[PDB]
Design a protein around this ligand. Structure first.
Ligand SMILES: [K+]
Ligand SMILES: [K+]
Ligand SMILES: [K+]
Ligand SMILES: [K+]
Ligand SMILES: [K+]
Ligand SMILES: [K+]
Ligand SMILES: [K+]
Ligand SMILES: [K+]
Ligand SMILES: [K+]
Ligand SMILES: [K+]
Ligand SMILES: [K+]
Ligand SMILES: [K+]
Ligand SMILES: [K+]
Ligand SMILES: [Mg+2]
Ligand SMILES: [Mg+2]
Ligand SMILES: [Mg+2]
Ligand SMILES: [Mg+2]
Ligand SMILES: [Mg+2]
Ligand SMILES: [Mg+2]
Ligand SMILES: [Mg+2]
Ligand SMILES: [Mg+2]
Ligand SMILES: [Mg+2]
Ligand SMILES: [Mg+2]
Ligand SMILES: [Mg+2]
Ligand SMILES: [Mg+2]
Ligand SMILES: [Mg+2]
Ligand SMILES: [Mg+2]
Ligand SMILES: [Mg+2]
Ligand SMILES: [Mg+2]
Ligand SMILES: [Mg+2]
Ligand SMILES: [Mg+2]
Ligand SMILES: [Mg+2]
Ligand SMILES: [Mg+2]
Ligand SMILES: [Mg+2]
Ligand SMILES: [Mg+2]
Ligand SMILES: [Mg+2]
Ligand SMILES: [Mg+2]
Ligand SMILES: [Mg+2]
Ligand SMILES: [Mg+2]
Ligand SMILES: [Mg+2]
Ligand SMILES: [Mg+2]
Ligand SMILES: [Mg+2]
Ligand SMILES: [Mg+2]
Ligand SMILES: [Mg+2]
Ligand SMILES: [Mg+2]
Ligand SMILES: [Mg+2]
Ligand SMILES: [Mg+2]
Ligand SMILES: [Mg+2]
Ligand SMILES: [Mg+2]
Ligand SMILES: [Mg+2]
Ligand SMILES: [Mg+2]
Ligand SMILES: [Mg+2]
Ligand SMILES: [Mg+2]
Ligand SMILES: [Mg+2]
Ligand SMILES: [Mg+2]
Ligand SMILES: [Mg+2]
Ligand SMILES: [Mg+2]
Ligand SMILES: [Mg+2]
Ligand SMILES: [Mg+2]
Ligand SMILES: [Mg+2]
Ligand SMILES: [Mg+2]
Ligand code: NA
Ligand code: NA
Ligand code: NA
Ligand code: NA
Ligand code: NA
Ligand code: NA
Ligand code: NA
Ligand code: NA
Ligand code: NA
Lengths: 129, 140, 150
RNA sequence: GGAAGUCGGCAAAAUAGAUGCGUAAGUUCGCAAGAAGCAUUGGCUCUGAGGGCAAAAAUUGCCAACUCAGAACUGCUUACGGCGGGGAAUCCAACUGUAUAAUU
RNA sequence: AAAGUUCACCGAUAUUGCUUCAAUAGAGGAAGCAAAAGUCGUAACAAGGUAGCUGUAGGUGAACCUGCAGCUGGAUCAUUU
RNA sequence: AUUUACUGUGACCAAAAAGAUGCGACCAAAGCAGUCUUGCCGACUUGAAUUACAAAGCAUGGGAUAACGAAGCAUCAGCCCUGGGGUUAUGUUGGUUUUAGAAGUCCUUGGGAGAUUAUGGGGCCGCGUUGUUUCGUGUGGCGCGCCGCGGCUUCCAGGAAUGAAGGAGGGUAGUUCGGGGGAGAACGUACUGGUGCGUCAGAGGUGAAAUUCUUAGACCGCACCAAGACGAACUACAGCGAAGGCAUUCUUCAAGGAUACCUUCCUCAAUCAAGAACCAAAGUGUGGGGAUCAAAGAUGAUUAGAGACCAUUGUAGUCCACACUGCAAACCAUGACACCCAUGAAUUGGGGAACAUCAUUUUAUUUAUCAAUUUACGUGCCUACUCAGCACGUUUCUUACUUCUUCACGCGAAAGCUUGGAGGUUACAGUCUCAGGGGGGAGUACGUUCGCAAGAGUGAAACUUAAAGA
RNA sequence: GGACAAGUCUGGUGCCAGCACCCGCGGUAAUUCCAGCUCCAAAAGCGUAUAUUAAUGCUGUUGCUGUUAAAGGGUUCGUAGUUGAACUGUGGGCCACGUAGUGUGGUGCCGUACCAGUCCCGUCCACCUCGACGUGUUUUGACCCACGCCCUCGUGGCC
RNA sequence: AGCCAGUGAUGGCCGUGUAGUGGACUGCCAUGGCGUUGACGGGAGCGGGGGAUUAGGGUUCGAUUCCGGAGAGGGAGCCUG
RNA sequence: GAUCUGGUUGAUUCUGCCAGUAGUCAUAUGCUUGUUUCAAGGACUUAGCCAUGC
């Protein structure tokens, strides 16, 4: 059965961008999925997306602009101390010049660059570049 | 394909413990069985008495007589066969002499075309075999 | 996939997005409650009450009018079944199979199916004991279960 | 002293009741088994447990029978009768039974 | 207040018996691995000259043979429209 | 009543050793020293500051989680006020006795609330049965309006609950679908053996023969009888089953999947050490049965030989009932669950459209960036009834076994795989579980569990090899 | 000789003696043995044996493999264990001013294009002249970021 | 793959003994205590601060200077303090 | 220093091991050894046995 909604959604987006599609449909939706997409959109990696209501878990349609190379989830959600950001950047990112690691902290869901500014650790959710 | 569970530490620990017995290198160093079968008691050298001078034929592609010796170890009274290196060098060894024996280079494995030999003579009468060969010393 | 098989069946009903009853119904909430209690007196299960209302009296859902589910209505009126309906229907099927096996002792196919049904029963009973719908220390036994069933 | 006797341990010696602990190979899983083996046992003075019948009832009163389990003190000359010696193997017959009254 | 008497308790040591572990002799019967270019055949590799192989049962100097069910890793991806 | 994990910041933590600031011991490994204004001295000389798992302890933060509780009629008491009822302090200690409070406990006035309408039941019965609002002053649209009544009474809480997962379970229906399973009764030819007639000299078998049967009538022809097994052609890159497996007809018994549904319920789930049930053929035990074929055995050939291949026989077995065994190239040599995934022809079951049967949006003169309706279409059979039926043609949908020789990425050492992955993986993390670590010795020895046995499960080492393998 | 830096030099031996961690060399012309001469490495140091760490992603949590190379249980059920769908919710005003996307209306509007008229050719394919819509400006206004202030910071209820 | 109970095994009551708590020990009472989250048994071994090898994660050593424990051939008992 | 090379074929691409390589206050043995500073030193086997002096 399906055990992770976030992992399912990120696999659908990465698969569609590999095939050069313009839109992708994601089902089911969740609060964590929407927050993850808002971080990607703020940095300019996807574009506009829309949520459709069906009185159950919703559906999401995402528009892709072709700037996203790969996104993925990290399972299980390992803890990350504020001094451990460099270790994760070295392991799962193409370089130290671009790309983001997404964390869930007591201040909310954010990328690793913002978390370093606020000096907070948390649990690693995923990445995109 | 393995667990990847976040609360499955016990399963991963048990898996590695069972599967670590499947490599000969790890098993040999942890089993105490090869040590008992080893004529040396886990040491690098041993001393013994010469019983007989024998000639061992080389393996099939080669053709020679290898000029080995039969030695009984002092520490536990085990009998082994040891190679005597270098040209001549069998004239320096007599019966009932005391020799120092070391291994070959492969940790209990036979080397070269000599069939079942894994030891070589290093000292005789406590002088040094290679030193005798180069004439730097005289046999006492 | 099915719990105890290899089938991938998708047949099911799809509830509508709009939950308000249609304007031509003209049936009060009190009238629906009365019709539900009458059928239960006749001796019908909650599943059969809903189909009878849907097929003849034009009520698509008993929750959209009266705001209550069928089994909740019966519990309030004190006419709820002693054991859950889905559990009862499984026990009845196992009883019929055992009766057939008494005369036919070479039916290895039926013996296999009896194993699956009894496994389903024990899983169902475990859930109902946890949510306190069955009394604790309630057990299914093949000898006793012939009673208390159709 | 301990089978050196003798065809041959023949004959004799020897074990022995009860209680507690413990018990091998083999096996048709029932047995083998009391396998093998170790300890206690007297007398005297005490203590506890094990029940019935009555009554205006975790109470009171009255009463019978002989088992079991303990303690202190004290003693031995090992002291009636009765009562398996044990173990490791080979051959034959599966077993209980019958059968040359008067040599098998 | 010394020697000395009796009892209780702690208990070395010795003997006997069980249990457990570690090394060890043995007539004979087998197995494996090597050497020597020994004797008998030719089972496999081609349709290897009876297609081969798996499971099982019996037989025979040796490889092997035979019966029953299976497989293609076959020597056929194929012939009442 | 709120708690842990996590995370930020600080407390509590021997030295030596390890990381580090400073100082030209001639440099360095070191050490904690040393420097100079030429000193009856000075630098208030220096010797800084770190890390040390896991557990424990203080005070922030609340996103991801986890421990609790509950399973929803096992429930729900609405607040504030005024008028009634029925321990102190008396100068101190020790005693009797009271007046009041407060509390509870019944009546009553004042006020404002309510998350779910005092109007729900009877009977006592009697009577009769043109005003806004659009839209171009005006037109045109506008929506609302333009057993019945009756007084009384008693009983009554019965409507406030996230939603129903393209997760699981249950229900109803076509008495749907199929070599799915268990029971009876029958049917069909054929092999073998008999019986009755006819005829007369060979028949059988092979590469060629021989073993074998035959004037005491074999082989052949017709008719019939007995017994046991088996269900040809139709039969397919078809169906059903968890796998092993399943093929004549009719009558019965209990099941199973798919489809349809505005039925019910509300996380009940996925995978799994231990544990259980089933499991081809051969094989074993006890009774039946015994036609065919046929391990063992016999005879004839062939051959240098032939314990084989070929021929004629022939026992166990092959079949049924009840018990065992659990060893397969038990194979898709490919574990289960879940997501995404390009193309054209076909096919098996169900449903919708069609056929047949019944019944009788604005707009829009000057538009367009991802359309507001591609929904079209006929045939054959059919009462002088398993039938409002049965097939075909056309377009959609859910489930299943597949193909491309006119199938795309991608992947792989290659052969090849490809919605059904061996793809979406060094750009390496969806969940669980079982195996492997050079070739042999070897699935062998020893020990132990199971078995009547045959065997099955668990399972080493000493030695020996430079390759074995794809 | 190669891995591995450095001789196709000169004598001796002739599958012998010997070398060789591995591949291999030696039967008459040995780049490998025994020696001479040259040359190489690192050096007051340099070989050999045994154990251990790295080489080793050949123990794999990071991070292995399982169609054919070693490796998926004969099939289902199933306990301990591991893993488990969505939801209660992150506010609004007031200025300012460089942005700041969009709709709705203002303001003028050379040239181009479109629609509607007039005339004209053709009947199978062409042109003229006007009363408006567009396109392009320029402001408004709603989204957006930066900076200040305020809010009983949903509604209600006081004031 | 089960361990523990005559003769203390888990707990209770009144005591004794100790410098002091306590099944530490005497008497009586109940049937408990531990275990696949690996008890019971077996093998190697003094524990730590630390050493070696350093992309990171890891693997391996620690008789030996400092801290703690134990012993004085084996094993038992004791006086003085 | 986040590094690899030789061996299976008539040639090719793999799996996989054997061999090579660097360190060790890590032990032992062989050859050699001019100067200086700093240092471990009967643990491994036998918690084996001890003359003599302190
Ligand atoms: K006996
Ligand atoms: K008898
Ligand atoms: K053959
Ligand atoms: K051949
Ligand atoms: K066979
Ligand atoms: K049989
Ligand atoms: K035959
Ligand atoms: K198997
Ligand atoms: K079908
Ligand atoms: K020469
Ligand atoms: K590997
Ligand atoms: K006490
Ligand atoms: K003193
Ligand atoms: Mg399951
Ligand atoms: Mg005698
Ligand atoms: Mg005599
Ligand atoms: Mg006698
Ligand atoms: Mg026994
Ligand atoms: Mg006895
Ligand atoms: Mg007898
Ligand atoms: Mg007798
Ligand atoms: Mg007689
Ligand atoms: Mg042929
Ligand atoms: Mg052949
Ligand atoms: Mg052949
Ligand atoms: Mg054969
Ligand atoms: Mg220091
Ligand atoms: Mg549901
Ligand atoms: Mg006939
Ligand atoms: Mg047929
Ligand atoms: Mg059979
Ligand atoms: Mg029989
Ligand atoms: Mg057979
Ligand atoms: Mg034949
Ligand atoms: Mg025959
Ligand atoms: Mg049969
Ligand atoms: Mg397999
Ligand atoms: Mg591959
Ligand atoms: Mg592969
Ligand atoms: Mg991976
Ligand atoms: Mg191996
Ligand atoms: Mg047995
Ligand atoms: Mg038998
Ligand atoms: Mg076996
Ligand atoms: Mg060279
Ligand atoms: Mg070179
Ligand atoms: Mg070497
Ligand atoms: Mg030469
Ligand atoms: Mg290593
Ligand atoms: Mg590495
Ligand atoms: Mg394989
Ligand atoms: Mg399989
Ligand atoms: Mg969740
Ligand atoms: Mg020790
Ligand atoms: Mg130490
Ligand atoms: Mg030691
Ligand atoms: Mg030292
Ligand atoms: Mg010392
Ligand atoms: Mg001491
Ligand atoms: Mg000593
Ligand atoms: Mg060739
Ligand atoms: Na046959
Ligand atoms: Na197959
Ligand atoms: Na395909
Ligand atoms: Na490694
Ligand atoms: Na240690
Ligand atoms: Na100490
Ligand atoms: Na090969
Ligand atoms: Na000097
Ligand atoms: Na000097």
């Amino acid at each position: 059965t399906m055990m992770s909604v976030l992992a399912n959604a990120l696999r659908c987006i990465a698969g569609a961008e590999r095939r050069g599609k313009r839109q992708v449909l994601i089902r089911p939706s969740s609060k964590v999925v929407v927050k993850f997409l808002q971080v990607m959109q703020k940095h300019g990696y996807i574009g506009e997306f829309e949520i459709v209501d069906d009185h159950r878990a919703g559906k999401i349609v995402v528009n892709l602009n072709g700037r996203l190379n790969k996104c993925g989830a990290i399972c299980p959600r390992f803890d990350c101390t504020a001094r451990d950001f460099e270790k994760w950047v070295k392991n799962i990112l193409p370089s130290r010049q671009f790309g983001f690691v997404v964390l869930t902290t007591s201040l909310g869901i954010m990328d690793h660059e913002e978390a370093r500014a606020r000096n907070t650790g948390g649990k690693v959710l995923g990445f995109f570049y | 394909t393995k667990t990847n569970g976040q609360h499955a530490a016990r399963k991963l620990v048990r898996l590695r413990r069972k599967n670590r017995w499947a490599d000969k290198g790890w098993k040999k160093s942890h089993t105490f069985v090869a040590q008992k079968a080893n004529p040396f008691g886990g040491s690098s050298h041993a001393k013994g008495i010469v019983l007989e001078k024998i000639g061992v034929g080389a393996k099939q592609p080669n053709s020679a007589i290898r000029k080995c010796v039969r030695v009984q170890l002092i520490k536990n009274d085990k009998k082994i066969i040891a190679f005597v290196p270098n040209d001549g060098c069998l004239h320096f060894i007599e019966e009932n002499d005391e020799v120092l024996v070391s291994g070959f280079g492969r940790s209990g494995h036979a080397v070269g075309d000599i069939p079942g030999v894994r030891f070589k003579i290093v000292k005789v009468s406590s002088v040094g075999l290679y030193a005798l060969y180069r004439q730097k010393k005289e046999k006492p | 996939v099915r719990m105890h098989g290899n089938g991938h069946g998708k047949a099911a009903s799809a509830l509508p997005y709009r939950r308000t009853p249609p304007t031509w119904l003209k049936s009060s909430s009190r009238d629906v409650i009365d019709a539900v209690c009458k059928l239960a007196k006749k001796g019908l299960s909650p599943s059969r009450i809903g189909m009878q209302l849907r097929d003849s009296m034009g009520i698509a859902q008993v929750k959209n009018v009266t705001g209550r589910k069928i089994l909740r209505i019966l519990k309030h009126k004190g006419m709820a079944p002693e054991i859950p309906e889905d559990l009862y229907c499984l026990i009845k099927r196992a009883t019929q199979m055992r009766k057939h096996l008494e005369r036919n002792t070479k039916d290895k196919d039926t013996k296999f199916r009896l194993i699956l049904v009894e496994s389903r029963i024990h899983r169902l009973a475990r859930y109902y004991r946890r949510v306190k719908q069955l009394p604790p220390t309630w057990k299914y036994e093949s000898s006793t279960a012939s009673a208390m069933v159709a």
